[PDB]
Ligand binder design. Sequence first.
Ligand code: GNP
Ligand code: MG
Length: 296
Amino acid sequence: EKTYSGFVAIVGKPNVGKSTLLNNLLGVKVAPISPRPQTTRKRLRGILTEGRRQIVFVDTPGLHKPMDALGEFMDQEVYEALADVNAVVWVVDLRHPPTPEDELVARALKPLVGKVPILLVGNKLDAAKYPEEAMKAYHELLPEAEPRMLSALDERQVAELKADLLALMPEGPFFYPEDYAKSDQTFGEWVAEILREEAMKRLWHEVPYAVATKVEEVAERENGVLYIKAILYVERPSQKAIVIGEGGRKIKEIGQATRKQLEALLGKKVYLDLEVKVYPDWRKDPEALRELGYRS
Ligand SMILES: Nc1nc2c(ncn2[C@@H]2O[C@H](COP(=O)(O)OP(=O)(O)NP(=O)(O)O)[C@@H](O)[C@H]2O)c(=O)[nH]1
Ligand SMILES: [Mg+2]
């Protein structure tokens, strides 16, 4: 009879496991993940429907001090993610004590204390040496939050968190139909993000942060083969050379890894063509940002 529905923002500094947590809460990979401290750049909605209850999760960019136009967009994305939700999941890395970036998040959540439930989720319990001490320090930054320690990779602990969040949703009609996709994004966007993820993990120094991607063509082909053409943009000529690599070895590595992940997630054959292009300092180009989808 009755139905419950709400939004849950997932926030925290970069690299704590926010996107990993979302994918595991949903049971399907919808968000890019990488070991680099600036992977997510735009809010991403993950739709969880369980029985008569629905949660629209909002993954967000890691909170940080903006350095350029892209950073400003990202900062605005976090701010807007926190404007109207029914609960907030603040993810922290239990492997170390709070950093100034974590304190930045605690500060951003103060106005929500007492207004919306805040769950302080300590992540990476599996790799933390001093989980308890770390968790205690994080909690002192926002005493009002409900603390818990887990690994976003642990099925049982994540399922427990999911149950606790569903019980917090207010009565109301579902925001999305119960048969809606697991995330609110186009197939093209999802593919471009998978490619960016594989690129970021295989590039170093400043290059990962200069990478943007876009799918320009998707089409049925060959013998049940899905054809995909995508562009990997960089900000400068020296980066293009490095992404391509000696004899095109680097871009081939990236392309192969992306094709294989795509085939494993889609369960079908994929033929992927990649082209590397320079989009002149696009992170500072308002027009470029709009073309690339970082619009607002
Ligand atoms: N050992 C361990 N690693 C984890 C866990 N959860 C996430 N990670 C790792 O932490 C890194 C960052 O995870 P990710 O989900 O991209 O973090 P994020 O908070 O979304 N980063 P950003 O804000 O930049 O988008 C990845 O290498 C990921 O595999 C966990 O429970 N245990
Ligand atoms: Mg992320």
